[model samples]
Target: NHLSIVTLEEAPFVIVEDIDPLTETCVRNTVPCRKFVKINNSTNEGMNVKKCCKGFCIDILKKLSRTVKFTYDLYLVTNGKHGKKVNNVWNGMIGEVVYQRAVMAVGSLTINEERSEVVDFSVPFVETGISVMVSRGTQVTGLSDKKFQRPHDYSPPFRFGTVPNGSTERNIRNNYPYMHQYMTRFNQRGVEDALVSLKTGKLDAFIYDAAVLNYKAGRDEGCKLVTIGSGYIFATTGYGIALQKGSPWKRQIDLALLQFVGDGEMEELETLWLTGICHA
Candidate 1:
């Protein structure tokens, strides 16, 4: 009849914005606009600011709700990560589901072995893989060259990193130990921070999800960013909706997803949310 869904802010998938003060609520159905957070920082601890959520995943959830005949409240994950295991514990959206804090967790949550062991995932809604991004002018074309295999091959050393405590970072640490030595964690919540660093010359490159980088590069200012090694892939995965490991709703959700895919609803949503603007 009702459910609580945890989500994360990821472009095209789960986008978040502050609700308009004048209205105090989202104008569209299916958006969770009532949740507010306290504005606090080292500088100031301020009043409540309402947050509204929308995007591809939101739309998918909306459809699922209609199909399952359930109303749902959407809330952001406490920590803005897809989920990761650290020091023998789980954290992030997957963590929320593992602990039974919510009925489902959505967004660009990659289906992986570690997470699958802790939480059940529905059929994949979209495909994804690990990739790197660099400024258009960077000389590095790919990570497989003999130069990259050697840790100190670069004259000044390459400064590349990924969002800390995420699958991208874990993938590098576990699969590309050589690159890990040169790694620097961005330590920020979103790709915007890492992209800023790469664009401003603070970072030589940023390793992250290929889909996200493609979205950013195509819409980036002046087309200054480009993704190399188009043929390279590691830990290739798919984005899936996560639920408690033994939840009964998994079958219902999976059935709805299969229907969406069969009817081209999935393709239509992908076109609506994933399109880019750059011609070059």
Candidate 2:
């Protein structure tokens, strides 16, 4: 099978590194050229660079490519996000699926009814939940008590950061209408911008997926960050491999995922890539 994979650049899920293809001895020089330029905004900005990459989604795709027997192309999501449907049109990587721009999407994509109505999702490969991440020394007064549901009464500033039209963005838009004015929609500079702003007192907290947050906070650059506000699951969700609605590849994808799980490949991968996974 030949497939087009739409993905996002989110750490632990998808990450990009810059390298020199000519200098790479591991560039499959034994038989053919295996080195490839990483997909990124630079593809448009005239700054493309050849690089070897790794992450949860990229690694998962490696496993799938090996077992599923496919040649493929990788494309980055337009907006560095997993955008949701709006006015019957989808945006970002999910949009690529909706528009037939790609055969499937592999990243930190949450499976929800809104998306399922228009696309097909393979059985969930990863279970995840919503959580809040804050800078070091920041005290989130009422989040631990489920007060985040209506935080105006507890944390008056109500400043939070989220990517525009993303799962967390729409979640806050739909559920926290009162706090809308205070939410900083990070449409530019990616999650790193929100995180940096949070670290420097621009935001009370930044909301994102639990596993992703935990993984990020453990990194050296993210050492000053921490996932806090225990006992409050903002939303319980799962990540799925997404295909176009009624995709012919769905069955193959599902079966491959099953094999991965049964053969312990999934377990081994989780140990290698997922953070706080053993605890989970």
Candidate 3:
């Protein structure tokens, strides 16, 4: 008989200890075997032992668990770490484990060339672009020099901040070649931290995805989203689940993802997670 199990490490999405069946071997089978392993690349978003212990990712994983014939377990890991580090540790830990089935459900995880080299990614579930955010009172009209007729010799002098190691930061560096050197970096660990910093005037602008920036702007009284550029400020990117290289499960995941998009499940999920919630 094939033993089917689903494991997750991010909290509010999946709390490791609270997972049922509470078997020692079951817990041992999850990824990021050691404590302090970081999950999502969000550092400024206020993830903790209680909050993400089981969040959006867990909700979806649970749904999948019920539909499929799999025993599920939630694993806990850290937030605000580098993707390269997470990949290294995760790959090392899951080493050579043969499974009847497995799947990952991390969200908004950008499918980039670097990551594709390590693991296979399912078709993009959602597409998003980066934008520049400014303080409410600030009069910054544009980021790129071309936006202005005169093409100012100096780009905005403000200190722009973004979650470290995220596509936004990378895209800003690559696309706005002029301001790349000055971009202030923060981990997207918690949106609260970024908000606090932005509110306190530590940062002039926070460059991030449109969904997240709009989400923050709606909740916060001090900040406003100024511009979403016309061209690809960043290349089109999508979030995909990561699997161990050469895993046959990739095909199943790809099929499921197709179904997810086909049946409008993906859109429904985005509306629920991205639009409905307010910053707490």
Leading candidate by lDDT: 1
Candidate 2 C-alpha lDDT tens digits along 157-237: 456665666676666577667555455543324567878788887776777766677777766363788775334355667
User: Which candidate number would show the highest TM-score if scored against the true structure?
Assistant: 1
Pick by lDDT: 2 or 3, better one: 2
Q: Write down the lDDT of every candidate, Cα atoms only.
A: 0.78, 0.69, 0.49
Prediction 1 global C-alpha lDDT:
0.78
Clashing pairs in 2: none
| Cα deviation of 181, candidate 2, in Å | 3.1
Score candidate 3 by TM-score against the native.
Answer: 0.63
User: Runs in model 1 with CA error above 4 Å?
Assistant: 33-50, 139-141, 185-189, 229-234
Model 2 earns a TM-score of: 0.77
Give residue 107's error in model 3 in angstroms. 3.2
TM-score for each candidate, following the candidate numbering: 0.87, 0.77, 0.63
Per-residue alpha-carbon lDDT of model 3 for 138-183, expressed as tens digits?
5554554332223233354446567765656666666566555555
Q: Quick one: how many clashes does candidate 3 have?
A: 29
